[PDB]
Structure formats: structure tokens, C-alpha cells
Amino acid sequence: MQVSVETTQGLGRRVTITIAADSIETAVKSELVNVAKKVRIDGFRKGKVPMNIVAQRYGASVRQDVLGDLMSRNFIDAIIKEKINPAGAPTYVPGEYKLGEDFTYSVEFEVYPEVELQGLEAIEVEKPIVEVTDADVDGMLDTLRKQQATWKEKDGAVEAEDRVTIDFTGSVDGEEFEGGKASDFVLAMGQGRMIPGFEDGIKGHKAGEEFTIDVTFPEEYHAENLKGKAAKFAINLKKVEERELPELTAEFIKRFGVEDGSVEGLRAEVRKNMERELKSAIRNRVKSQAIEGLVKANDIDVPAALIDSEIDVLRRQAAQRFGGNEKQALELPRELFEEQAKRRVVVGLLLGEVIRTNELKADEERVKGLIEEMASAYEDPKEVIEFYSKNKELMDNMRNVALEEQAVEAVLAKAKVTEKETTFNELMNQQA
Amino acid sequence: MQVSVETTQGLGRRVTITIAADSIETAVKSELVNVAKKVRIDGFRKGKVPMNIVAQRYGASVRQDVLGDLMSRNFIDAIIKEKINPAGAPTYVPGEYKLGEDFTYSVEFEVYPEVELQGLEAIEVEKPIVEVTDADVDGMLDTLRKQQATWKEKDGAVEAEDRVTIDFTGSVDGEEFEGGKASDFVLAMGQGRMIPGFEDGIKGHKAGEEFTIDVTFPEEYHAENLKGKAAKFAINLKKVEERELPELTAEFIKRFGVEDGSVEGLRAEVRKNMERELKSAIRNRVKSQAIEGLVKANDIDVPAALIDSEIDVLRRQAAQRFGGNEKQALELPRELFEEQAKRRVVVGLLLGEVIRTNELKADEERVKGLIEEMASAYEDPKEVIEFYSKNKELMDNMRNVALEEQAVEAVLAKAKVTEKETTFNELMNQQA
Numbered sequence A, B: 001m002q003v004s005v006e007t008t009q010g011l012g013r014r015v016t017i018t019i020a021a022d023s024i025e026t027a028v029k030s031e032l033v034n035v036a037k038k039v040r041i042d043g044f045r046k047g048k049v050p051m052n053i054v055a056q057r058y059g060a061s062v063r064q065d066v067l068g069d070l071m072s073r074n075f076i077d078a079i080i081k082e083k084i085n086p087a088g089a090p091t092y093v094p095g096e097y098k099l100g101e102d103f104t105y106s107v108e109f110e111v112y113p114e115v116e117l118q119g120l121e122a123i124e125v126e127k128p129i130v131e132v133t134d135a136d137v138d139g140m141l142d143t144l145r146k147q148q149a150t151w152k153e154k155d156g157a158v159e160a161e162d163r164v165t166i167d168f169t170g171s172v173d174g175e176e177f178e179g180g181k182a183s184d185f186v187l188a189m190g191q192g193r194m195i196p197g198f199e200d201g202i203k204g205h206k207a208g209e210e211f212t213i214d215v216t217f218p219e220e221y222h223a224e225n226l227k228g229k230a231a232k233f234a235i236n237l238k239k240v241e242e243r244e245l246p247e248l249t250a251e252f253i254k255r256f257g258v259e260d261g262s263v264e265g266l267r268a269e270v271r272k273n274m275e276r277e278l279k280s281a282i283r284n285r286v287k288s289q290a291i292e293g294l295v296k297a298n299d300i301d302v303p304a305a306l307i308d309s310e311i312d313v314l315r316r317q318a319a320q321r322f323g324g325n326e327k328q329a330l331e332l333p334r335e336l337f338e339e340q341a342k343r344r345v346v347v348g349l350l351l352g353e354v355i356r357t358n359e360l361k362a363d364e365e366r367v368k369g370l371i372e373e374m375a376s377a378y379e380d381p382k383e384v385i386e387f388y389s390k391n392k393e394l395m396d397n398m399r400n401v402a403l404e405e406q407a408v409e410a411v412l413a414k415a416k417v418t419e420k421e422t423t424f425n426e427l428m429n430q431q432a
Helices: A021-039 A053-056 A063-082 A134-148 A263-297 A302-323 A334-358 A364-375 A383-391 A393-414 A424-428 B021-038 B051-058 B063-082 B134-147 B262-295 B304-322 B334-357 B366-377 B381-390 B391-414 B423-426
Strands: A012-014 A126-129 A151-155 A165-166 A167-171 A177-183 A185-187 A214-218 A230-232 A238-245 A416-421 B013-016 B124-129 B150-153 B162-166 B169-171 B176-181 B185-188 B213-216 B230-233 B237-243 B418-419
Touching: A021 A053, A021 B391, A053 B304, A126 A263, A134 A263, A151 A424, A167 A230, A263 A334, A263 A393, A302 B051, A334 A393, A334 B162, A364 A383, A364 A393, A383 A393, A393 B021, A424 B262, B134 B262, B169 B230, B262 B334, B262 B391, B304 B334, B334 B391, B366 B381, B366 B391, B381 B391
Parallel strands: A126 A416, B124 B418
Antiparallel strands: A151 A238, A165 A185, A165 A238, A167 A177, A214 A230, B150 B237, B162 B185, B162 B237, B169 B176, B213 B230
16 A cells, blocks of 8 residues: 655645555455444444445545544644544644645644763762751751731731731832732731731831831842832831730641640651651752753753743643743743743753663662652542552553653763762851 | 542542641642643753642632543543543533632533342243245245346336436425425335335326325334324326346446346355355344343343433434434434333343353454455455454454353353244244
8 A cells, every 4th residue: 555645835735645445445344344343343244235336325525524534543643653642632623625726734743852971981970978967956846836826806016027917019110010909818927928027017017107218129039020119118007916825725726737735746847857858959950950960061952842832831821820820821922831831841851851861760679669759748648649549640651750860860870979078057058 | 648529419520639748848749740741841941840749829710620630530530440431521511610719610421320130030932943045045035036127218117126216305295304305306216215115106107197195104213203104295207227137248247246147146145145144033033032031030120321322323323324413413302212222221231240240251263263254255355354363352342242142141051942843934923
């Protein structure tokens, strides 16, 4: 058999294969019965009319539709072998059909490039060795202690950790923005829930005076309408409640996911949480050094399509952390996310090539171990472990996490990693 | 942890679970980071703002969106364990949201019932034993011989197997219908491509005379607009070619998927095709006896939804064999397909319950054997076999074919099957 596929323009495709009647006769019989089996209609055939006879009767009428069916089957077959997973449903975009002339349709799909690994040996990574002191523990403990407190109504002055009701309106330089609209909003002070200085500036004000305070948001603020802006908050005030020491009688203080009062338990829980992120933090710097070393020294021309797709994901996610508005995130500025999107694609391409070139395997043992530690954080690890193994997406999505660890270890094994003993204060010097 | 899900009306569901702040505090942290991992944004977290703090800030704004996300994740999890495969994309149908009040959405999904197997031992099946004679072979051979012939232009009388060009219009009783429209249509006579009598009635007419002949379509004709109708065909005529004996020199006669001229090969190919469908024919009667015995004796109440879905599939398929028109098949009459759809659902339920109750396994050996014989009908069975094993849907879809065979054997093993030697003529008596 002979196969021919043409291209009209860009992503446009054309099928229409011209062959001898004998070949057509044979192919149509086989294909039509195969389609009939899919929907189970062949079993309803008593065989009074041969399939070929009806094929050369109604085949002309469904001739256009057959091309569409072929399009449907060929597309799915092709994406399976090229391993492309479309989001929802693909778009084929059919045009006007002329009888006796050509036909144009454009199937939208993305493509992938290839990369070469160079300068791997030239990667020098410094591993700063630091430890967590008991003083660090004290700071964390104190923060946790100030988080909880029992509310008590009073009238007079305002503390730094009181509970207040603030009706405020967000005005930038002289105009209200989309957010910053409050009504009987209750805010817990002393928890660092607002901008540093915001809950400080309102301290000492009576629950009935309008002051208007200048608050400046950092240039690197996630909200574009607030980043690098110095807004003024009127702050009306009306209700203030004192937060007194929480009842250590397990009455009110039982609002924790950890056991109450247990001094050893509290320190133990802090210790495990601190070291867990310490492990992650050191690896993040190691990972960052490796990533920057590759990107800065070796860049590659990346297709715009892949970057464009990354932007949408970023926009949807950004809107969520700005407030939450599905689909409206589409309206968010492209330039803000396009920069970071480029990095995501480059890193992915770099990792993907390492995996392919070194033919890395998805290690089940590695995945299982990670799951067990993570699942151990819950009361019943048994259902949690099974839950992850229950859903295929979770299994595969989590693989990329474990696989990434393998990729890092592979590079580090051949890279120059030097361990240097440093004081905690020394690593704290991150001024630029 | 406590879970809750309420129902508004019908398929309408309500989430909104009210729990203590401590539980919320813990649950939100775990869930949000899990979502962030899915899109790979957690690796961008340097940890300046605790997740809980932002959660009790923007959580209110995205509160509605969270419910939608929960809806999305819960639905997919639920269908996995209940094993329901949605066609494309599900519909959740959201309504108006009132702040401070309730919310209504309705998720459209189908359900399945269960059946009891009774009266299986009461099924008596007669197996008529017949054979194919050489006379049957001769008839088939002659039919095949008349199919092919070489066209030769002439002027005069018309044979029974000539090649003609007929411009006609389809008028029922006094109105043209949707089809029956021809222009320069070339029809090959003697191949039984038209209604018995249609190509017989035009025999003897000159290539330039309008006669108008009454043609009656059978009551059980697939085309509703023609079934039980006696239409009149004008028949204009203009071009007639004689079909002379095909060149047995392998020139013209090479338009077959079988070797040319080979007498033994021709008979061998006929023999294999005839017995293959003979096997199917006897089993179909056996299957029909068992199916009718169950349906006629034991009826079950079937939900309208399942039947409704079956109707659409039938409509789409019916339109294809009537001509071909995707989506327009929706406009086809329901009653025509609803009757047969009921049978499909009942048979499926009966088979499904047999499979579940008798805990039947999908036998790979059975599947492999069927594939090998089927693939043996192609030049290279190797790629064909791998192709079936390549696509999961083909593998699964084909399993049902093999599994049905197993189900039939299981029933027959305990049913009263009697073999009776019969003459071919005897079985031919199917006059009602």
C-alpha cells in the first residue's frame, strides 16, 4: 500500500490518496467492518448486502465525512507514538468545502526540539555547611507562641498583637483599584499577616479616628497594581479586642495539629520541620548553581509555542495567589510571566536531554521511599500511600519529582562539589 | 476527618463543609502545596511568606474557585473507582452564585443496575448440522465471475450486465426526497447494486427514452423515506457500454486481491471465506436462541438514560449507512432506534452479570488466537498484531469480542444443546 499526505499551509494538511480500484475495493471492506465492530453493529449483520456494494453506493455521500474520521483516527495514533498529551480536546479547524476542488483544515499542535550537554565538568558547586542552633529554635517557638491567643473585649489602647476590625479602601495615588475592598474585615495583629509596617502604623490609634498612612509595597511585589506603589490607607477602625494568653488547660489551646503542652513534642516537631526545609534549602542552592551555570553558559533557541503555553499556566496560577479568578487570568500581562516561562522550558529541556542521553530510569524504589516519608506525616499512611498509587496522574506527576533528584545526583557525581564549613551568620550575608 | 456532601435537587450537589479552624489550618496547607506541585510552582518557593498566612488572606477571594477545583478533582477520583468512562468532557452546569446564600450546580452522569440469572438450565438450543456443497461453490463462483468485465462502447440493445450512465431523480409519490439526486451517474448492471428489479426493469430501453417505472421498496428498508413506499423512476438514459469478458491475460483481470487465473486458488479462497462465515452463521443462531430465551422469559426495568445514549450511537451509525452526515444524525427518528437499543442494553446487562457472577477472566490466550487468524489475512501479520497490541482501546475493545465467546461457552456448557443432522434445503426453509 502507498500513503500520501500533503500540506496546504503551515499546520494545514491534506489527505486524499489516489489508488487503483482493486486496492480501494479491498481497503474499504476491511475498514468499514472494523468501524462497525467498534460500535458493535457487525453482529447485527445477516449479510444480505455485501459491504462493498453499499460502499460504492453511499461512499460518495460520506466521502467528506470519511476524511474527517481518518483525521480523527490518524491524529490519536500519531500522538501515542510521539507521546504528546493534549489538554482536553484538539482543534482541527475545518474550512469551506468545495465540490470538485481542494479542502483546507489546520490542526493545532506543538513540537519539541533537542539539546546538547556541554560544560558539565566545568560546573563548580559550593556547598556551605551550616547548622541550626537552639537560638534559632527559640525564635521559631516564640513566633508560634504569638500566633495563638484568646480574644477579650476591652476599650482603650491597642497592643501589637490585638484583634481588630478594619474597614478600609485601597487607594493607590488617588484611585481605588480592583482589590482592597473591605467590609467588617477582622484582622489578627501580631501575626505578620500584613505588610511589615502596616500593622505597626495603626498601633496607638483609637477605635474611631481616621488617620491615613502611607504604605509602600516592594518593587518585587506579586501584585502588579501594588508593586513599586506607595498607597495611602485611611484606616477608619471601630472594634478592637485584646488577645490574652491562651488557656493552657487544653480548652482553647487544643486548636493545634500537634499535642498540647508537650515541651519535648513541641521541640521535636520544630526540629523535624526545620531540618526538612534545611535539606531542601541547601539542595536549592546546589540546584540553582547547576541551573545557572548551564543556562548562562549555554543557551538554545526555544520555539515560541512552548513558551506561550507556559505563560497561560503561570497566569492561571498567579491569579489564584492574587485572589482567585479562573479564566480571567488570561487577561494578565504576558511579559511578567514570559521571562520566568523561558527558564522553565530551558530547565525542562536540559533535564529531559540528560534523562534521554544518560537513559535514566524512573526508579520505583526512590518514589516509594519519598512517598513513605511524606505519608508518615498523616495519621494513616496506609490509605495515603495507596491513594498515590491509586491515581495514575499522581504516580506519574510524582515521578518527575524523584526523577529530578536522580538527575541532580547524576550531574553532581561528575561536578566539582566542595564542602565548606561556615557559620550560620556567614551564610546570612545575602545582601545582593 | 469528617466528610459531607449534600444534594440540592436531582444531580445537583452541594459541598461546603464546616469544621474547626485547627482542622482548616492543617488541611489548607497540605492541599495548596499539593496543587502547587502539580503545576511545579513549589520549587519556586523560597519560603518568605508562610502558606497559611496567604491562605487566610486570598482564600476568601478564591473560595468559590476552590469549590470548583474540589469538584474537578473529586469527580475524576469517583469515576475511577466506579469505572465510568465519560465521552470527551463532562458537564457540571453552574448556576448563579449569591454571596451569603447557597449555590446550585448539576453534574450530569449515568448509572448502572444489576440483574439475576434465572432459567439458564431451561434453555434448549438446537444446532442444525448442514454442509456446503460444490453446487453452492459454483453459484458463488459465477457471481464473482459476473462482477468483473471489460467496458466496450456500442450502440444498440442493453444486456443484463452492461455499464450505463443514468441521470435520474428520486420522486416518491409526487415529491422529491433528500436523496435520489444523480448527475452523470455511472452504474454497473449485473452486479446487484440496485434493488432487485430496478436494473431489470430498465433492460431493453433505448439510450434516449423516458419510461418511468414503478419501484417498490421493502417494508423493512433501512431508509425510512423509502421503506414501504412505491416510488416511480423516470429513467432518462444516454450512455451504454457493453461489458465484455475480462482479459484473462492478467492485464485487466489483475484487479483482484487474490491471484489471477489460479483455479485451485480461487476455490481455496472461496472455501475459506464460505466456512468462516458458516461458523459465524451457526453460532449466531445458537446465540439468538439463548438471547431470546433470556429476554423473553426474564425482563428487567432499564433506566431511560442508558437507552437514550444507545440511541445516539445507533443514529450516528444509521446516518452513515444511509449516506453520511455527522451530527445531523441527531435529527433522526428516535422510535426506530429505541426499540433495538433496548435489546442492546438488555444483552449487555445479561452478559455483564454473567461475567461478574461467574467472575470470568479476560483470557489473553483467547484474544491472541483470534488476532493471529485475523492477521493471517494480511501480507504481514507481524505489524498488524503489534498494531492491535500498540493501541490500548483496540486491545480492550477486542477483549469484549473474545470475552463474549467465553460467555457463550459458559452458558452452553450447562444448557441443553442438541445436534441434529439436517439437509441444506431443510435449513433454507425460513419462510417466517
